[PDB]
Design a protein around this ligand. Sequence first.
Ligand SMILES: CS(=O)(=O)N(CC(N)=O)C1CCCCC1
Ligand SMILES: [Cl-]
Ligand SMILES: [Cl-]
Ligand SMILES: [Cl-]
Ligand SMILES: [Cl-]
Ligand SMILES: [Mn+2]
Length: 340
Amino acid sequence: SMTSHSWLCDGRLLCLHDPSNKNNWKIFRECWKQGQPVLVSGVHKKLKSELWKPEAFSQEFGDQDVDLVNCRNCAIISDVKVRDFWDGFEIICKRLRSEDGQPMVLKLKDWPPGEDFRDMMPTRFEDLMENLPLPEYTKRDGRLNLASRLPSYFVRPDLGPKMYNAYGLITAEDRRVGTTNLHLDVSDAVNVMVYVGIPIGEGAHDEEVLKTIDEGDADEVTKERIHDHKEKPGALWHIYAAKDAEKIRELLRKVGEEQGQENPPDHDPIHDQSWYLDQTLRKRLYEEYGVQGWAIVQFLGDAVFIPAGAPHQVHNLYSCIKVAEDFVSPEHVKHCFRLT
Ligand SMILES: CS(=O)(=O)N(CC(N)=O)C1CCCCC1
Ligand SMILES: [Cl-]
Ligand SMILES: [Cl-]
Ligand SMILES: [Cl-]
Ligand SMILES: [Cl-]
Ligand SMILES: [Mn+2]
């Protein structure tokens, strides 16, 4: 039977089933006011799937100049063609190699650049914006989005959306690394998985993906989405309540000191965007500071709602294309106020 919703993270995470259901707000707003993230599945079935393929991005935009990051060591690969990234998205033997001769795990940095998404890709922009869930919250001019309505006493988000493109992490050592490191945003955001690329050549890399999800602390119902429904998993997220950010800063100041970093006692390890919380650090956060998070596996077509001020990190299981839009809900506008 079709149902309006279900629960993940043992009842702590709302999962809405129909992205275009006009009654979603009634269930959504109760969870959202308490500072929880929310998941909405099925957004891929609303989109024009031909507009979101890596081969199309390569063919249409391949000649533009970009920087990449090596996700294993944070090295920057300067001033290469965007086709050098896209043509290795799923075919492993086409990927740029490190000195060791291994194919690199790469992230495409700031592409499209700044606020240029709408100008460069007007048809993609239309397809996405017209199919975002909770549109009174997420559309540029929706009635519950205060972005366009606030004075300069509030930090206003840039014009979006922003695209996030990166390969999947592969090895046991890769389990300890992030695609995007732990950080927080002063605005709310919705992040949609529009494409998951399962590669070929080293195409049989299914079992380390399971160990990563398991060690990632994913719930039993989330593991049933793979084994029972054969949905494509993109990325493993950890999200923490805005109210726990200072306890996370205290853990990361202590670990920094243990590892011989030499940091003033007030510096901000979350703003630095330099940490990924691996299994050891997440267990220590829980045991020593009493802080619990949400471990979320974002499948193809899943939209993750991230509350303003909530620390979060992203670990790609396979190659992913994500598109995110910022918004300012009245529930969380305190997070972007420039005084007290
Ligand atoms: C110190 S901070 O965490 O960077 N911060 C203060 C601010 N004025 O932006 C806000 C960040 C969003 C959540 C509420 C706090
Ligand atoms: Cl809050
Ligand atoms: Cl376009
Ligand atoms: Cl809505
Ligand atoms: Cl990062
Ligand atoms: Mn973010």
